[PDB]
Each structure stands twice: as structure tokens, then as C-alpha cells.
Amino acid sequence: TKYSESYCDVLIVGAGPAGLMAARVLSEYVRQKPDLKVRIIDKRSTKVYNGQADGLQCRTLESLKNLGLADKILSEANDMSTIALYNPDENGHIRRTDRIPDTLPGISRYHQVVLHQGRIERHILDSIAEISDTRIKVERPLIPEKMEIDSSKAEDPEAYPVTMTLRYMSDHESTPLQFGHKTENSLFHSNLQTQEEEDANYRLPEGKEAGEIETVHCKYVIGCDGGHSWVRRTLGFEMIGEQTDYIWGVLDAVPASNFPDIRSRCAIHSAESGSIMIIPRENNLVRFYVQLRVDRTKFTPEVVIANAKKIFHPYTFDVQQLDWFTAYHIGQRVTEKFSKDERVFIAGDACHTHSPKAGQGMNTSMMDTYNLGWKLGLVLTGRAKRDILKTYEEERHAFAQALIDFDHQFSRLFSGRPAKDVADEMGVSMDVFKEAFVKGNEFASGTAINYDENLVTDKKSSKQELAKNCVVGTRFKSQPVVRHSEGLWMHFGDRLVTDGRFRIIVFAGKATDATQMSRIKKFSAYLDSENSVISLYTPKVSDRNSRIDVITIHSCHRDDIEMHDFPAPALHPKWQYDFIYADCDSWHHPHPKSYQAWGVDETKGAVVVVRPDGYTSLVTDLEGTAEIDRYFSGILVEPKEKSGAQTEADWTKSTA
């Protein structure tokens, strides 16, 4: 009945974790250039709880911290702390054989935590509201009906190569089934749903007046539409993998059990009834993953509870209150392609589906659009070349394959029967299981990713040895530093606010040394010069740390050198105190030995280039200014009016 037409820079299809992270990242570029139009749609109402996830891993939290979202999430989430392993003994009774750390010591300053997905979303929704000044909001219930891509306009910055036809649904079309169960349940969301049903349930019924069918001309489209992604199926992107018939059930409940480790993360392998994974949650809840075509109507809590009782034998297990529940089969799926012309992208469950044994979904799916987001943002504001969009798929698809590989094995070890004795070859070795879990915990933290050389990751021009624990292509790891301004001891990763800027981390080394200070001054003379990356890439009369943020971490105690002993304003910006940090001893903490943790020489230092994303992309010395120019030349687009050579007088000397 109503036919409409409009244009937009980005269309995000799906407002789950992936889609919302995409919106949150894009919001920053929308605030810098308010003409940009970024829309995000969902086809579901908010009346049926639409979520299922609860775990946030180490690198997700470091990233959320850089988006200003971690402290609010951390004030409510639960740190499970320990993984207690339970398996049958001589007589087949389950007992605790071991305990391993839920997060690996030293891997990150943030530990994995768990929290209701709806609270995670709310926090991301508030941030989007703030960063976009309420301008970007989820539109629902809306659903794409057609997608037409003109591959001949793909490299044209003025074109709108993707035409999306959206249908405005009815409240009833947008409401998912609940299969007759009283308890709020996300068996709709569940992966037992079929993509057929996913499309069939939100379909314009028969007595059918689409309320409105909108023709949206888009520069870019991001498909964050889940497991059965319609965006993926319409691009023709196959998905390799096959679903087992191992079936598990999920209970979010306030338990009433004598199980000694009911409040700890646990793995329970029973002799013959299946496994359980306990995920202790906030506010007295505990999540239970209980091992059990399937008729979802008959899939009740009761069936799941009866099976959990068998697995817990001889400990007791009862539910005091049940908030939600689901079911899922064990299966792994991945696509080979994440992009169609670097115009239509898929992210999140749309690209990779797997079991929840290591709670990786929401994590990986937000990290996908955290990666894509800054690349799209720089492209959209005219700051970076379109070729950086190829790095999305280059970096994230290999990661999804490694994710599916890890889940493939971990889910099967988790779902198999434990070996009775050593001769029982077709049982699961509990020692192999422990080994897989410990090894899986490094991968599952999200902190071990190493991106292969690409347009925004330059290994070839790097002297890696100058910063040995700052491996190009890996996340720039936070380490404690002492802010020079007042002596505040802090995690340096707090300083890397994600807002589209690249960083140049200047490890000034032993700045009191006359020879080292000569190198530092020469580097700052480069920075101040007419054609440095600072002068070239920061728009005329804009702040010189507004595109490329130049931060100095030195090796001296702050009693031995002043901030004004560093070049001003190249390294010591006028009346600004978030630029000079020190690897030294402080009132409440010992010398953190951060240069050493970063693998950098304490006397000579190094220069490390970090992406907007927080991933190290270049490692050189203070003399490697040509490698810095070349790195930025292949990525950034020069503003129409450049800042040019630094013309301000040293503010620390100047009399007023």
C-alpha cells in the first residue's frame, strides 16, 4: 500500500550484537560528518526476549573498554573465575579431578565475565544514543525482500550500487513463536529454528497489505542477520559444515543443589547420561548447558531438568526459578566469502555458526563489525581509500575458520561419553579434554589473533625486533604505565580510545641521554615538517592529534625529566596532559617493567603504529619516518586543506 524511496550510506540488516556493534562504531563517523546516513533495521519485536548469549571474552572487553562500555557491563557481570572438571571415578560417580583458570593468568587485564545479553545490548544502545546524538536508532519491524547489486558501480564513490527493498511488517509478523511454553524462552532465536521458518514466520500474510515497501538505495550494506542470514543466502555464499544430532538444552535458573561447585564454571562428564556445562551468572542465576526431527513443542524445561538430574547424580539439582531456556544441536558452519564487491558484507552468525561450549558467538560477531566498522567509517568520511575494505574479509574469514576448527573438536569432546578405562578407545579421554580446554582458553580469549600481512598490516617494512612483544598484526597489548602529568598509575590500553584515529606510539627510551634525546628531537622535527603524516593527514586548523594520535611512553622516572623536556607541541601538546607516560616506579606500585613486557629496548626505544582497532600495524625506530609515510600513504586520503608544517611556538617557553 505505501511505496517509498530513499538513499543511505550504510544499511545494517540485523540489530543483534554484530549489528549493534556496527552501529556503535559507525556512530562516531556520523557525529564527525552529520550528513552521513546510517540505518539499522530488525524484523523482530522486542516483546519476546530476543537474545541467548551471555559471555564476554578478554579482547571483547578490551574493545568495549575502548568504546566506553566495559565499566558499566562489568559492574553487573559475573566473573566465573574457575573451571571445575568433573568425571566419573572407579564406580562411575562424578567427582572433581581438577580445576583450571577460567581466564589464563596474564593474558589480559580483563577476565571473561558473563551477563544477560539484554543488559549488554542496553549498554550498547545507550552509547549509540550518545555518540550519534539519538540520530541512529533501530528501525523495526522491517525486513528486506529484495537485494540488487550493480557490480559496475562498485568503485564509484558517488554511486549507490546496492538497492534494498524493505517491507514494513506488522507487530504479529514480527513476533516469534514460543511453542506453547510459559517461561520466556528463546527457542525461536534458537538454532533449531529453520531458515525457512525464520523467513516464513515474518512473512507478509495472505490478508496482506504490506503497510509500506521502501526502495533503499545504499552505498553499503552489512548483513548481521544471523545463522540463517537472508543477506548471505541471497549473495549465494555457500556455508560448509554439517549438523550432528547431539542435542543439548539450556536452563537459566536460580538453582537449589548440593553440588559443591554450583557457583563455579564446570564441565561435568557423566558415565552414561551426557555432559553438563555450568555457567555461573549474575544475581544468583546459573546457566546450565545440559546434554540430552526434534519436536520443539515437546522440548520442555522438565525434559531438560530430568536429564540434568541424571547427569548430576548423585548430587541434587532443582530449579528455584527458571527465567529462560533453549535447545540446540551441535554443528559448525562457515562461509568462504564475507564480501560481495566490498559493497555488501556479512558479519557474525551470518558467517559462522558453532556450539556455545566456549561462548564465542556474540564475541566473534561483535569483533567482526568492530573490524569492518572503522574501515567503512574512514572510507565513508573520505579519509581512507576503498581498498582497505578488502582487509575485512582477509582478516575475519580466516579467524572464522579457526573458530569453527576449534569448536569442531571441543564440542565433540564435550558431547562424548568419558572413557571408562584406558582401553575404552571410543570414549573421550578426560586428559585430552582438559588439554583441549586449557588450549582452547587461549584461543577463546580472542587475544591471540595474528592478522596476515595486508594493506593495513605492514610486517615487511617492520623491524619486529625493536618491539618483540608487539607483533605486527596482533592486538597492541595494554601494560601499566605512569601518566607523567600527576603520576597516576594506569593501564595504558585505557588511553587507546576507539574513535577512528590511528596511533603512533613513540617509545622514547632513556630520554635523559643526550644521544637519545637527539633522536627524539629529530623524530619530532619530522612530525612538525610540512610533509609528515601529521601535517598531511590532519585537516587545516584541526587538532594535530585528531587523526593520528601521537603518544610518548618513555623509560625515565618522572623525578628525572619533565614533560616540557620533550618537544612541544609535537610530543607535548599545548595545555594537554594525555600524551607523555612513563615506564617507572610509582607511589602504590613497583616499576611495571612495561618496556620489557612490550619487548622494547629501554634505552633506545621504538616507534609502534597502532590501527584504529587497537591492532599493531608497524614497528620501526625513530629514524623509520619513511616507513611511517609509506604505511599511511597506502591507506589515508589527504584532506582538501592540509594542516601543513607545525607553525606554533613552543608553548612551554612562550611568555603570555
Known binding residues = 17-18, 42-44, 50-55, 117, 289, 349, 359-363
Residue number with the shortest CB distance to ligand FAD?
A: 361
Q: Which does 41 bind (CB under 5 to 8 A by kind): a copy of itself, ligand FAD, none?
A: ligand FAD
Q: Under a CB-based contact definition with an 8 Å cutoff, are residues 45 and 141 in contact?
A: yes
Q: Which does 130 bind (CB under 5 to 8 A by kind): ligand FAD, a copy of itself, none?
A: a copy of itself
- Rounded distance between C-alpha atoms, residue 140 and residue 169, angstroms: 8
As annotated, the active-site residues are 54, 281, 289, 356
| Residue 151 CB contacts under 8 Å (≥ 6 apart), including other chains | 161, 341
The sign of the torsion formed by the CA atoms of 213, 219, 225, 227 equals: positive
- Rounded distance between C-alpha atoms, residue 173 and residue 365, angstroms: 26
* Closest among 507, 515, 528, 464 to 602, alpha carbons compared: 507
β-sheet bridge partners, residue 253: 286, 322
- Rounded distance between C-alpha atoms, residue 651 and residue 43, angstroms: 56
Least CB distance to a copy of itself at residue 136 (A)? 12
- Rounded distance between C-alpha atoms, residue 593 and residue 507, angstroms: 13
> What is the rounded radius of gyration, in angstroms, for the C-alpha atoms of the chain?
27
- Rounded distance between C-alpha atoms, residue 308 and residue 69, angstroms: 35
The sign of the torsion formed by the CA atoms of 416, 418, 420, 424 equals: positive
Residue 159 burial by Cβ neighbours in a 10 Å radius (0-12, 13-18, 19+): middle
- Rounded distance between C-alpha atoms, residue 367 and residue 613, angstroms: 10
Q: Which does 249 bind (CB under 5 to 8 A by kind): a copy of itself, ligand FAD, none?
A: none
Least CB distance to a copy of itself at residue 573 (A)? 13
Kindly tell me which of 490 and 525 has the beta carbon lying closer to a copy of itself: 490
Binding site for ligand FAD (CB under 6 A): 13-19, 41-44, 50, 52-55, 117, 143-144, 191, 224-227, 230, 250, 326, 328, 348-350, 356, 359-363, 365
SS3 helix, strand, coil % of the chain, rounded to 5?
Answer: 30, 25, 45
Least CB distance to ligand FAD at residue 136 (A)? 16
Q: Which does 465 bind (CB under 5 to 8 A by kind): a copy of itself, ligand FAD, none?
A: none
Q: Under a CB-based contact definition with an 8 Å cutoff, are residues 30 and 240 in contact?
A: no
Least CB distance to ligand FAD at residue 352 (A)? 8
Kindly tell me which of 76 and 212 has the beta carbon lying closer to a copy of itself: 76
Q: Which does 333 bind (CB under 5 to 8 A by kind): ligand FAD, a copy of itself, none?
A: none
Helix (H, G, I), strand (E, B) or coil at 38: strand
Q: Under a CB-based contact definition with an 8 Å cutoff, are residues 324 and 372 in contact?
A: no
Report the half-sphere exposure of 545 (CA within 13 A, side-chain side): 21
Residues in the chain: 656
Kindly tell me which of 332 and 498 has the beta carbon lying closer to a copy of itself: 498
Least CB distance to ligand FAD at residue 363 (A)? 4
Least CB distance to a copy of itself at residue 137 (A)? 12
Residue 599 burial by Cβ neighbours in a 10 Å radius (0-12, 13-18, 19+): middle
Q: Which does 377 bind (CB under 5 to 8 A by kind): ligand FAD, a copy of itself, none?
A: none
Kindly tell me which of 411 and 441 has the beta carbon lying closer to a copy of itself: 441
**Binding positions for substrate:** 54, 289
**Binding positions for FAD:** 17-18, 42-44, 50-55, 117, 289, 349, 359-363
Kindly tell me which of 192 and 467 has the beta carbon lying closer to ligand FAD: 192
Q: Which does 280 bind (CB under 5 to 8 A by kind): ligand FAD, a copy of itself, none?
A: a copy of itself
DSSP letters of 78-127? B---EEEEEEE-TTS-EEEEEEEESS-TTS-SS--EE--HHHHHHHHHHH
Locus of grid cell 558467517: 351
The reply to whether omega before 141 is within 30° of 0 (cis) is yes
Q: How many helices (H) and strands (E) does the chain have?
A: 14, 27
Kindly tell me which of 19 and 255 has the beta carbon lying closer to a copy of itself: 255
Bridge-based pairing of strands 344-346 and 352-353 is unpaired
Least CB distance to a copy of itself at residue 305 (A)? 12
Kindly tell me which of 17 and 592 has the beta carbon lying closer to ligand FAD: 17
Least CB distance to ligand FAD at residue 10 (A)? 15
- Rounded distance between C-alpha atoms, residue 337 and residue 411, angstroms: 24
Q: Which does 588 bind (CB under 5 to 8 A by kind): a copy of itself, ligand FAD, none?
A: a copy of itself
Helix (H, G, I), strand (E, B) or coil at 503: strand
Distances, alpha carbon 369 to alpha carbons 26, 60, 116, 274, in Å = 10, 12, 21, 36
Kindly tell me which of 106 and 205 has the beta carbon lying closer to a copy of itself: 106
Least CB distance to ligand FAD at residue 456 (A)? 23
Q: Which does 225 bind (CB under 5 to 8 A by kind): ligand FAD, a copy of itself, none?
A: ligand FAD
Binding site for a copy of itself (CB under 8 A): 71, 75, 79-82, 99, 101-103, 105, 111, 126, 129-130, 133-134, 186-188, 190, 255-258, 260-265, 280, 314, 316, 318, 320, 485-489, 559, 562-564, 575, 577, 586-588, 651-656
Q: Could you give the maximum distance between any two Cα atoms of the chain, in Å?
A: 86
- Rounded distance between C-alpha atoms, residue 196 and residue 180, angstroms: 20
What are residue 332's phi and psi, to 5 degrees?
A: -130, 135
Least CB distance to a copy of itself at residue 616 (A)? 25
Q: Which does 294 bind (CB under 5 to 8 A by kind): ligand FAD, a copy of itself, none?
A: none
Least CB distance to a copy of itself at residue 559 (A)? 7
Kindly tell me which of 201 and 474 has the beta carbon lying closer to ligand FAD: 201
- Rounded distance between C-alpha atoms, residue 14 and residue 138, angstroms: 9
- Rounded distance between C-alpha atoms, residue 151 and residue 235, angstroms: 12
Kindly tell me which of 185 and 332 has the beta carbon lying closer to a copy of itself: 185
Q: Under a CB-based contact definition with an 8 Å cutoff, are residues 492 and 478 in contact?
A: yes
Instruction: Please give the angle made by the CA atoms of 463, 464 and 465, to the nearest 5 degrees.
Output: 95
Kindly tell me which of 42 and 528 has the beta carbon lying closer to ligand FAD: 42
Q: Which does 80 bind (CB under 5 to 8 A by kind): ligand FAD, a copy of itself, none?
A: a copy of itself
